[PDB]
Design an enzyme around this catalytic site. Structure first.
Site, mmCIF file in Angstrom:
data_model
loop_
_atom_site.group_PDB
_atom_site.id
_atom_site.type_symbol
_atom_site.label_atom_id
_atom_site.label_comp_id
_atom_site.label_asym_id
_atom_site.label_seq_id
_atom_site.Cartn_x
_atom_site.Cartn_y
_atom_site.Cartn_z
ATOM 1 N N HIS A 131 0.853 -1.112 0.049
ATOM 2 C CA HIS A 131 0.005 0.088 -0.200
ATOM 3 C C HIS A 131 0.993 1.048 -0.125
ATOM 4 O O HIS A 131 1.949 1.231 0.765
ATOM 5 C CB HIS A 131 -0.750 0.136 1.268
ATOM 6 C CG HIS A 131 -2.038 -0.569 1.182
ATOM 7 N ND1 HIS A 131 -2.143 -2.087 1.247
ATOM 8 C CD2 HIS A 131 -3.581 -0.554 0.984
ATOM 9 C CE1 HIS A 131 -3.229 -2.411 1.024
ATOM 10 N NE2 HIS A 131 -4.034 -1.327 1.103
ATOM 11 N N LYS A 158 -1.189 -7.866 -4.460
ATOM 12 C CA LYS A 158 -2.226 -6.642 -4.178
ATOM 13 C C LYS A 158 -1.467 -5.492 -4.282
ATOM 14 O O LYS A 158 -0.490 -5.251 -3.181
ATOM 15 C CB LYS A 158 -3.195 -6.910 -3.014
ATOM 16 C CG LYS A 158 -3.862 -5.760 -2.592
ATOM 17 C CD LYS A 158 -4.536 -6.004 -1.582
ATOM 18 C CE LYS A 158 -5.651 -4.710 -1.037
ATOM 19 N NZ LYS A 158 -5.880 -4.655 0.374
HETATM 20 C C1 LIG Z 1 -6.817 -4.168 1.021
HETATM 21 C C2 LIG Z 1 -7.393 -2.976 0.231
HETATM 22 C C3 LIG Z 1 -8.721 -2.330 0.584
HETATM 23 C C4 LIG Z 1 -9.067 -1.206 -0.146
HETATM 24 O O1 LIG Z 1 -8.476 -0.383 -0.684
HETATM 25 O O2 LIG Z 1 -10.239 -1.324 -0.118
HETATM 26 C C5 LIG Z 1 -9.123 -2.831 2.008
HETATM 27 C C6 LIG Z 1 -8.022 -3.434 2.977
HETATM 28 O O3 LIG Z 1 -8.770 -3.649 4.035
HETATM 29 C C7 LIG Z 1 -7.500 -4.382 2.301
HETATM 30 O O4 LIG Z 1 -6.725 -4.908 3.182
#
Ligand SMILES: *[C@H]1C=C(C(=O)O)C[C@@H](O)[C@@H]1O
Ligand SMILES: *[C@H]1C=C(C(=O)O)C[C@@H](O)[C@@H]1O
Ligand SMILES: [Cl-]
Ligand SMILES: [Cl-]
EC number: 4.2.1.10
Lengths: 236, 236
Positions: A131, A158
């Site tokens: 992220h 992801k």
């Molecule tokens: C991964 C991504 C998410 C999002 O961007 O909606 C929610 C999160 O809880 C996930 O781990």
């Protein structure tokens, strides 16, 4: 083929009121994501207890457990050592189908491969996640990140990134799309915030495998209700 | 700021049943597109008659008249000379707000500028349009086409292309997005067919000005009802 994830973030007590809302939305939910980083000093035994309440629904959806560290936009302030012990110990809860493990450029690659190999030996599907809540790297860097995460042979990679403009949204879609064309590994690409919402609704159009929504309030920037998200997925 | 276009394709008699369905959808429709190429030997006087029935609603939406040639994916088999006389003569119907004129690489540029200058002198907004129903050119060619059409100083440039893959959809979005960032001129970019549907729903996300839907059956590959299209526009 894109699966709808419902993200929940309860406290050690999963409320009957929450179980009820999950059941009203049962046909929209392929994957239930139990976020646990919002529980200060969460333990594996507390996770096991919460999963006991959810497993009655185990026929209607897969269970994904996610500890999101604060560094990666969540609430978890565990040390790296305590976090990696939690990830490894989640292998022993029978009801878990999927486990999220975080990737960043500074990880101990050997330790990560050990834990990932252990989860998979215990019949857990691994989502390796990265992220960036501040920015979206250029296309070649996005592809680089997907490439480094797939080297662990996870079930899913992801990438979630924060756009500042239209090109940032298009670069996330293009990276996901190119990855999906060339690799067997499943891919999840999120452009966060309302600007990136098209990445969530059209995820399947661009070769992505999961799209994340909420039951009540947004659990991440740009999220919508899973009923509405399932309806969107169904349109494309 | 994206405006929803409702495309209709009647015969010389606009049915009361069609007027009724337009009125049920009045709040979704910013622009009513009267396609006329489906009328063999349509005249300006027949268009004027049909517009008399529509102008009662002129307060609720702009009227766009479009003769789509067969070469550009419509039903019109007028000669180039008869087609360009029809486009020029549409300047005299007071109720018309917008006129579509087709662009292709082989046009007489001087004649096109004359007609476009005439339409604008008669207070008509010009949509210069190019359709490729077989394929999507590479990004640099898409940008080239937008660039050549904007040289006529129209109100809108419209590019509609047929994708064969995900990259073709992303190239249409990227071309539209780059154009919208650099030019004052309004831009419309369509990736046709279900594969390109994201170009219609997220048109506003990528800097586009119009998105086209139907009242009944799809009037072009990938179209949805304008009520549903307005709902989509509202989400982004
Ligand atoms: C991964 C991504 C998410 C999002 O961007 O909606 C929610 C999160 O809880 C996930 O781990
Ligand atoms: C231009 C584009 C259309 C579309 O692709 O929906 C419909 C057509 O009538 C317009 O002229
Ligand atoms: Cl389900
Ligand atoms: Cl209106």
């Amino acid at each position: 083929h894109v699966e709808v994830v419902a993200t929940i973030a309860p406290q050690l007590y999963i409320e009957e009121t929450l179980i009820q809302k999950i059941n009203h939305r049962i046909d929209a939910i392929d994957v239930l994501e139990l976020r646990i980083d919002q529980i200060e000093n969460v333990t594996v035994n507390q996770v096991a207890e919460m999963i006991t309440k959810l497993k009655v629904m185990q026929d209607s959806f897969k269970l994904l457990v996610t500890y999101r560290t604060k560094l990666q936009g969540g609430y978890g302030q565990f040390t790296n050592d305590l976090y990696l012990n939690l990830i490894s110990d989640l292998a022993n809860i029978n009801g878990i189908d999927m486990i999220d493990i975080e990737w960043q450029a500074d990880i101990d690659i050997e330790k990560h491969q050990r834990i990932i190999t252990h989860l998979q030996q215990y019949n857990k599907e691994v989502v390796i996640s990265h992220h960036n809540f501040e920015s979206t790297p250029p296309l070649d860097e996005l592809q680089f990140i997907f490439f480094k995460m797939q080297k662990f042979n996870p079930e899913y990679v992801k990438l979630a990134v924060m756009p500042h403009n239209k090109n940032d949204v298009l670069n996330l879609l293009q990276a996901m799309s190119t990855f999906s064309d060339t690799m067997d590994c499943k891919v999840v690409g999120i452009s966060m915030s309302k600007l990136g919402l098209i990445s969530r609704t059209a995820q399947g159009v661009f070769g992505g495998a999961l799209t994340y929504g909420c039951i009540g309030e947004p659990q991440a920037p740009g999220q919508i209700d899973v009923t509405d998200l399932k309806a969107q997925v169904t349109l494309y």
